[PDB]
Structure formats: C-alpha cells, structure tokens
Structure 1
Amino acid sequence: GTRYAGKVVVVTGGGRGIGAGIVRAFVNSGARVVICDKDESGGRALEQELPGAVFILCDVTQEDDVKTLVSETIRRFGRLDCVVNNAGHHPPPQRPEETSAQGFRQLLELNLLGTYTLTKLALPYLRKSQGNVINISSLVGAIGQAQAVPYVATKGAVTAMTKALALDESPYGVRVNCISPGNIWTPLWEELAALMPDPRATIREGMLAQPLGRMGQPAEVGAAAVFLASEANFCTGIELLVTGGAELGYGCKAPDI
C-alpha cells in the first residue's frame, strides 16, 4: 500500500485485460492512476470502482488526444512518475500473402507509434520526477509467431525502441524497460480463440504452450510493472519475460530428409 505512494501513473489501454490488471496493481501500491482508453465502457467503471484511479478517454493513435492526456494528468495531479504503454492489438491470424502494407501501417500506428508519442510527450515531466517508462511488448517479438508478420514486427520494434530510449534517457536518471508477456488470459485472447475453427482446442493449446501448464493473469503482469516502477532502480533497458516458461525447451513446431 506504500511501495509507490505519492506517485502518478498513466496506463494506456487500461480499461480491460492486462491494462486493467496493471491499473489495479498500481492503485494497490498507493499510486494515483490515470486510466487511458479509446473505449469508455471498462475504464469508466474502473474509475468508479477504484479510489485513486480516474478515466481519461484517449486514442493513443491521435497525437492531440495524447497531448491532452498528458496536460490533464499534470493539471489534475501535479506530477508524472510512470507511463505504462499497454494499448495494443493482435489481428486475427493472417498468412503473409493475406496481409497488406496498409494493415501493417495501421498496426504500427497503434502498437509502436502510440507508445512513441505518449513517451515523447511525457519525458519532460518524467525527467523532473526521475520517473520511468514501461512498455508492454510480447514474447513473440523475440521468438516469432506463425500467421502474424505485422504483429510480430511491431513488438520487435517496441522491445528494441525500449533499449534505444533507455540509452538516451540514462543521463537524466529516467529508466525505460519493457515487459514481454506470453499467453495471458484476457478479452483479446478470448476474442481471437472464438474466431478459430475449434476455439476450445486453441485455448487448450494456449495453456499447454507453457511448462507451467496454464495461461498467465493480468495481475501477474501488473506485479511485474509495479516492480519495475518502484524497486528496480538499477534496471534500464531490460525485457522482463512474464511467459510461464513458453520460450524454454523443445516443443511441437511443425528423419533428416
């Protein structure tokens, strides 16, 4: 209740899923939290539920929405300590020949450039507070995924950008880290499974992709985020895996001819 007391945190895509788990974790740590989301439904309810959280409608692909998000955070709370860039999307499975440069550009706008834009607008305030940035990437940026060329590319970009910005902001004492989740049970995971030929089989495969034999929870990503913000003062430019071991060992990915 006191690990991050007195601090102000912005969480993008905080209305449901991982983002909402991160919001809850920071509120439980004593922080005040600004929930940013393009959708009113979940975020507005979260603001009613949690003292110390408020909701600001903001589409991170719209630069003026994001400018207003930062200026309202400062006007209302007087400081900014941490930005969590969680807003993002995974398209349906798409073979490479089924993708388009147009769709790729649109996914870059959300998953990469929205993270860039909020970070840029927040850094003057983060420098004053010696605050930090936490980007939500994905394990598949590191190891790849089938039927997801644009999505994987955007997450490889986020992870790399995290390291570049960590170098640039280190002289100011501003840390920049990312979390790479694996399979986390969220509304997005459920939506994707529901469009599959056999949703139940997809969910079962998703559980068995981890040595731990289950999917992760938003609360687990949230705890990792609170650690990076509040207790990781010698960590910058790291990729914190929250994956249940999915990257470990040999598995089913498809005698020497």
Structure 2
Amino acid sequence: GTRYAGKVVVVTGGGRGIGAGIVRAFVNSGARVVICDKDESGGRALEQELPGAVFILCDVTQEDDVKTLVSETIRRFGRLDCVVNNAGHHPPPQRPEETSAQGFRQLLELNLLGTYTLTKLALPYLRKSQGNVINISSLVGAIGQAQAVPYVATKGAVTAMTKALALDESPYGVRVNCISPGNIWTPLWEELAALMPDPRATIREGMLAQPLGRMGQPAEVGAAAVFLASEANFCTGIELLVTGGAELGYGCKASRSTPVDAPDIPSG
C-alpha cells in the first residue's frame, strides 16, 4: 500500500457510505486521511479503527468549520495533497411543486457551496503540493432523474464546476476531477428506500437500472478516487462514471403516472 504514501487527504462526509469507502481506499494506499463529517459517531469509529485516519468534526455548510478544518489539517500535518468533496445529501422523492426555494438553497449549501468553500480554502496548499481535487457528483447530473429537481441541479453544478476549476488550476498543475456514481448501495440509499411503500421493490428497481445487474459498492468508488489522485496524472476535468452502465442502451422510461397508448398507435 504505497501508491499514495505520505499524501494528506481530506474527505468530507467520510463517516459512512461512499465517503467511508474513500477513506478506507486512501488509508490502504498509505495516505494521511482527515475525515471531515458533521456526525461524530461514524467518524470516531473510523478514526479509532484506522490509524492513518483522524476525525475532525466539521459541517461543510459552515464557513468557520471549513476554515478550521483546513487550518487544523495544515497545522497538524504540514501539507495538503488531495481534497475529496463527498459530503452531500439526496432528499426523498419530491415533485417540482413539492420543492421549495428554501430547501433548494439548503441543498445548494451542502452539495455545491460546501464543496466550493473547502476547495477555495484548500487551493493555496494544493498549489504548493501540486495536489488535486476530486468531487463526488452523480450520474443524474448528466442524465437527469425523476422527482429530484433540486438534487439533480446541485450535481449538474458540481460536475460543471469541476471543469471550471480544472481550467483555473491547470497552470499550477493542480488537477480537478469528478466521479459520477450511479446507484451505490449505501446507508443513504437504504434510508431513502425505507421511505417507500415497498422498500425492497425499490432496491430491486435500483439494481435493475444497471446492465451489470447490481448497485456499486463504496469500495469501488474508493478505488476510482485513489486512481484519480495517484495514477491519473494526465486527467483533469473528467467525469469518471461509476454506474454499472446505467446510462447505456434503451430502458423503461415512461412512468407509472405517464399516459402511454396501446401499441396500435406507436407514435401518437
């Protein structure tokens, strides 16, 4: 485990789910990993289990928590090589009339502005290390998703912002890339399914959304992140799809509330 030995890595939302899979991936590569999370429980458990990981309580929507996160990372470890902006939320399914501008703003604070604020504060140090930024976006930023207008918007912004940052930071040799996971089996996925009338039917539909026939694992996103940080030196501004092929081929897109005619009038 030496492909990223000695590098200092900040992972937001690293207490569980994809974040924890990324923390473990970088630890196994030899990095010093600073777990940023608003929830103490998961981070402390990872901090105690993994020696290379330390936990720093930090809500990325609070400018002062993030400034303290960066300040403590430099003071305690002297450098910063990689920022993985993973902290993010997916609300329950909401139709457009079931969304509010206030909830949209709240979601932007977390999914977009938290990623922006940490990136900006980290860039002075990433420039000195010739480090790199990895944003965790989502496939639905590229292809849309039903009943998720605010969420889809925040992820479209993250993917685009990744490319803008890659252009701004290329003169320092600082790479900025993003991973777009499709359906990854995580506590978030499980919690959203548990809100549905038939949780396991929902999970099964999520599995059938991939030609590979399953959801991904946090560990597979984690391997994608370590590859971007440690072995993708000619990649900047890319969108690495970790989706099981969900974007490929024809599927079933007409919804249960969507008027569809019988097959004797195929084109209306």
Report sequence identity in percent.
100
Give the Å deviation of 1:255.
4.3
Distance in 2 (CA, whole Å) between partners of 1:109 and 1:256 is 49
d(CA) in 2 for partners of 1:10, 1:219:
17
* Cα separation, partners in 2 of 1:129 and 1:256, compared to 1, 3 Å: farther
Q: Please give the alpha-carbon distance, in whole angstroms, between the structure 2 residues aligned to 1:38 and 1:118.
A: 14
Distance 2:174 2:9 in 1: 14
Q: For residue 101 of structure 1, what is the aligned residue in structure 2?
A: 101
Consecutive unaligned residues of structure 2, counting only runs of 5 or more, are 254-261
Tell me how far apart the structure 2 counterparts of residues 255 and 209 of structure 1 sit (CA, whole Å): 24
How many Å apart are 1:159 and its aligned residue?
0.2
Query: For each residue in 1:154-176, what CA deviation from the matched residue of structure 2 results, as whole angstroms up to 9, or x when unmatched?
Result: 00000000000100000000000
Distance in 1 (CA, whole Å) between partners of 2:125 and 2:175 is 13
Structure 1 unmatched ranges of 5 or more: none
Q: Report the secondary structure of 1:185's partner residue.
A: coil
Residues 55/256 of structure 1: CA separation in 2 closer, same or farther (3 Å cut): farther
What per-residue deviation string (whole Å, max 9, x for no partner) do you get for residues 189-209 of structure 1?
Answer: 000000001111000001110
TM-score, normalising length from structure 2?
Answer: 0.95
CA distance in 2, matches of 1:255, 1:155: 36
Q: TM-score, normalised by structure 1?
A: 0.99
Give the structure with higher Rg (CA): 2
How many residues are treated as equivalent by the alignment? 257
2:179 and 2:246 map into 1 onto residues whose CA distance is 15
Shift of 1:46: 0.3
Give how far 1:256 is off: 8.3
For residues 34-53 of structure 1, the aligned pairs below 5 Å read 34-53=34-53
Runs of 4+ with deviation above 2 angstroms: 254-257
SS at match of 1:240: strand
Q: In structure 1, the residue corresponding to 2:191 is in which secondary structure?
A: helix
Task: Give the direction of change, closer, same or farther, for the CA distance of 1:256–1:28 in structure 2 (3 Å limit).
Answer: farther
Determine the structure 2 residue equivalent to 1:133.
Answer: 133
- Offset from partner CA, 1:205-243 (integer Å, 9 cap, x none): 011100000110000000000000000000000000000
Matches of 2:53 and 2:235, distance apart in 1: 27
Deviation of the 1:112 alpha carbon: 0.2
Q: Which residue number in structure 2 is paired with residue 216 of structure 1? A: 216
Return closer, same or farther for 1:256/1:176 CA change in 2, 3 Å cut-off. Answer: farther
Q: Distance in 2 between matches of 1:239 and 1:189?
A: 22
